[PDB]
Amino acid sequence: SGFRKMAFPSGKVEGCMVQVTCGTTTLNGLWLDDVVYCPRHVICNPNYEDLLIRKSNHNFLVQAGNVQLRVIGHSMQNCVLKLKVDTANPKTPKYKFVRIQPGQTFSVLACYNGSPSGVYQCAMRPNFTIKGSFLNGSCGSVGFNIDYDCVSFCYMHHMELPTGVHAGTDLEGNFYGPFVDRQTAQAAGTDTTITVNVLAWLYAAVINGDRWFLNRFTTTLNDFNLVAMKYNYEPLTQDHVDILGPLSAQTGIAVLDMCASLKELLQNGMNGRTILGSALLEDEFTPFDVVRQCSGVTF
Amino acid sequence: SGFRKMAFPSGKVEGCMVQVTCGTTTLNGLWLDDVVYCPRHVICTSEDMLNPNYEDLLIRKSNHNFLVQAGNVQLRVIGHSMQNCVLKLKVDTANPKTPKYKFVRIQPGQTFSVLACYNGSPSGVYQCAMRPNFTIKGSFLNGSCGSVGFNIDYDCVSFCYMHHMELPTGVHAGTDLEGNFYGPFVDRQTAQAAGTDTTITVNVLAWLYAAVINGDRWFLNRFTTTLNDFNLVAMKYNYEPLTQDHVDILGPLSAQTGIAVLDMCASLKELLQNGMNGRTILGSALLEDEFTPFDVVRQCSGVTF
Ligand SMILES: Cn1ncc2cncc(NC(=O)[C@@H]3CN(S(=O)(=O)CC4(C#N)CC4)Cc4ccc(Cl)cc43)c21
Ligand SMILES: Cn1ncc2cncc(NC(=O)[C@@H]3CN(S(=O)(=O)CC4(C#N)CC4)Cc4ccc(Cl)cc43)c21
Ligand SMILES: [Cl-]
């Protein structure tokens, strides 16, 4: 029993974290095989190819624990800088670079000076920002999932927006959202609630004995989406309904039956009650996270 | 900016997790140097649990009855002894991944990271607190016994908890790494129940200071309170008494934000009376008690917004 916001074990990622210094700027890098990946803003209206062309390999100081790594090459790929080093990381895990979609969750290993300080779980918001916890020096910190024994890197931290939310790129340097890596006026768009995730969390509550919100009613998908659009909830698609199939079979509650519970919660509130110790509807657990935590899958 | 429930990186602990099997029971063990630590109930059957006589069950076991597995490698058990509710298995190989470590016994209100494991394999990491009734609100399924709780301030791992059981309310009970239980619990399937749980007052106050540091002040008021009047009100909402030690401990956060501890207590009294009125504090509609004053100082910036 119990339901916690759970992150993946971070050990395979800790063995990849390094410190990258260029002039007065210091941030984090991801050392995989003989390449260190880091935000290209470490070299800083920027003209990144012009700033990069005047740098030599010896201008980039890379530190792995107490050892200095020797930079033998450098190149850019979108908003990520790739530093070729002389030594392959002996701790390189089996890995892939994957681009995630809004609604998908991942673990963040927050780092300062190439040293990991914490691990937390979060979700890519529909507005492409993440509600992270980052201070100055956290740029280059990464987001990941573990599938079997392979680390799938999906996020690299680059910046904080004026509302305190965060923006970054996949490991190929492409930003999530309409953001750019420069000091200019940027703002997160209006956000929405991840509907398929709230439904998954309602199923997790039912699995844990919290059933007060269940009702005899059902709804059509179209009527649910008309209601959901009024409360700034993302539209629920037939793919989401299919994805919630296993949880629906385990608890005996049809997805559209759970949608009618969600509709009543939106129009009437919780009436002084909580669900899994929360007075708000939680949207940072995917259907897969609910199944994984309520089954004990190991890495 | 931002405020998350954050766990310590779990790598130093992952390299210590092993699987321990004794007959039909399989649980997790912590391999440090040449010793594997695990709950002594690994020697029990489900029947034995009503009234186990561990000394009698243990004397009947030999070293080769305990099967220890570290990854794909079988470790050879060369000795065994019981220390309180923990079994210590002497093995013939020292763990090369043994970090710098200490065994520490924590007090209620303290937080720690839990690396939940099944079959000696880590599945997840989460943050939690030792409740005032000595239980933890964990996320543990069958096979998670032997999973550990820890803090990693600097480069040394301080092990503070080993998981042993789930009580009927779904909450969890366990021991320090010397095998002493937290709370009046026994590793016996006898009628046991968690005492009435209370809110960790010093932690809610720390979290209200974290909201001020991150730029939120809507909940503050022009009032102050005496410590005694605060406790008289707090106890009516099932909040733990706030002691002078707690007031002293909140000193640094009080100096950083410029809000006296008893002024923050007045704001807490008012939140308990009024609720939040549709507002949130650090993205939460409930008052959060699983962040200590030390966690707030570690996670937050030294410059108030
Ligand atoms: C400085 N700082 N504080 C916290 C924090 C967390 N993550 C990243 C940070 N850094 C950035 O985001 C940097 C610096 N900044 S800034 O304006 O100082 C950031 C700010 C805002 N809004 C918090 C005050 C400009 C900028 C522009 C582009 C890119 Cl790619 C990076 C950056 C963090
Ligand atoms: C079986 N199980 N499911 C989840 C879980 C989490 N942690 C520990 C577990 N195991 C125990 O707690 C065991 C077995 N049980 S039990 O009755 O099956 C526990 C239960 C309840 N209530 C969850 C179903 C008795 C008991 C008594 C004392 C000690 Cl030391 C160990 C144990 C977990
Ligand atoms: Cl303590």
Neighbours of B132 (CB within 10 A): 21
* Pair B161, B26: CB distance under 8 Å: no
Q: For the domain bounded by B1-14+100-197, which CATH number is listed? A: 2.40.10.10
Enumerate the residues of chain A whose CB falls inside 8 A of the CB of residue B143: 296
Cα distances (angstroms) measured from residue B146 to each of A7, A239, B52: 19, 39, 19
Give every CB contact of residue A272 below 8 A, 6+ residues apart in sequence. Answer: none
Residue ranges of domains in chain A: 1-14+94-191, 15-93, 192-295
Q: Tokens for A129?
A: 């920002």
DSSP string, chain B: ------BPP-HHHHTTEEEEEETTEEEEEEEETTEEEEEGGGG--TTGGGS--HHHHHHT--GGGEEEEETTEEEPEEEEEEETTEEEEEESS--TT--SEEE----TT-EEEEEEEETTEEEEEEEEE--TTS-B-----TT-TT-EEEE-STT-EEEEEEEEEE-TTS-EEEE-TTSPBSSS--SS-SS--PPPP-B-HHHHHHHHHHHHHTT--TT--S----HHHHHHHHHTTTBPPPPHHHHHHTHHHHHHHT--HHHHHHHHHHHHHH--TT--BTTBSS---S--HHHHHHHS-SS--
The number of C-alpha atoms within 13 Å of A182 and in the hemisphere containing its C-beta is 8
Looking at residue B138, its amino acid is G
**How far is residue B203 from each of residues A243, B59, B107, B266, B290, measured CA to CA in Å?**
39, 45, 13, 15, 6
Quick one: tokens of A139?
């740029």
Ligand 1 contacts CB of residue A2 (under 6 A):
no
Angle between helices A195-207 and A255-268 (to 10 degrees): 100
Residue B279 near chain A (CB below 8 Å): no
According to CATH, the superfamily of the domain at A15-93 is Trypsin-like serine proteases (2.40.10.10)
3-state secondary structure chain A: CCCCCCECCCHHHHCCEEEEEECCEEEEEEEECCEEEEEHHHHCCCCHHHHHHCCCHHHEEEEECCEEECEEEEEEECCEEEEEECCCCCCCCCEEECCCCCCCEEEEEEEECCEEEEEEEEECCCCCCECCCCCCCCCCCEEEEEECCEEEEEEEEEEECCCCCEEEECCCCCECCCCCCCCCCCCCCCCCECHHHHHHHHHHHHHCCCCCCCCCCCCCHHHHHHHHHHCCECCCCHHHHHHCHHHHHHHCCCHHHHHHHHHHHHHHCCCCCCECCECCCCCCCCHHHHHHHCCCCCC
Contact call for residues B17 and B37 (beta carbons, < 8 A): no
With beta carbons less than 8 A apart as the criterion, state whether B9 and A14 touch.
yes
* Centroid of chain to Cα A271: 32
CATH superfamily of B198-301: main proteinase (3clpro) structure, domain 3 (1.10.1840.10)
Domain spanning A1-14+94-191, CATH class: mainly beta
Catalytic residue among A16, A22, A38, A41: A41
- Other C-beta atoms closer than 10 Å to the C-beta of A252 total 8
Inter-chain CB proximity A279 and B286 less than 8 Å: yes
Tokens 């573990």 — which residue?
A: A146
Distance, CA of A47 to chain centre: 29
**CA dist A167 → A135, A158, A294, B25 (Å):** 13, 6, 31, 47
CATH number of A192-295: 1.10.1840.10
Q: Around Cβ A66, how many Cβ atoms within 10 Å?
A: 5
Among the partner residues B10, B125, B285, nearest to A280 by beta-carbon distance: B285
B117 touches chain A (CB under 8 A): yes
* Rounded CA separation B299/B305 (Å): 14
For B:162-221, CB contacts with A below 8 A are: 166, 170-172, 214-215
How long a stretch of residues is chain A? 299
With CA atoms as reference, report the closest residue to A152 among A30, A39, A19, A292. A30
Select from A112, A88, A155, A109 the least CA-distant residue to A21: A112
Q: Supply φ then ψ for residue A257, to 5 degrees.
A: -70, -40
User: Matching CATH topology for A1-14+94-191 and A192-295?
Assistant: no
Q: How many residues does chain B have?
A: 305
Distance from CA of B284 to the nearest CA of A (A): 8
Measuring CA to CA, which residue among B106, B121, B42, B130 is closest to residue B80?
Answer: B42
**Calpha distance B124→A293 (Å, rounded):** 8
Please name the method used to determine this structure.
X-ray
Give the residue among B298, B246, B300 at the shortest CA–CA distance from B268: B246
Residue B173 contacts by C-beta under 8 Å, 6 or more apart in sequence? B134, B135, B136, B164, B165, B166, B167, B181, B182, B183, B185, B192, B194
Q: Does domain B15-99 have CATH number 2.40.10.10?
A: yes
Helix axes B227-235, B261-274, angle to 10 degrees: 30
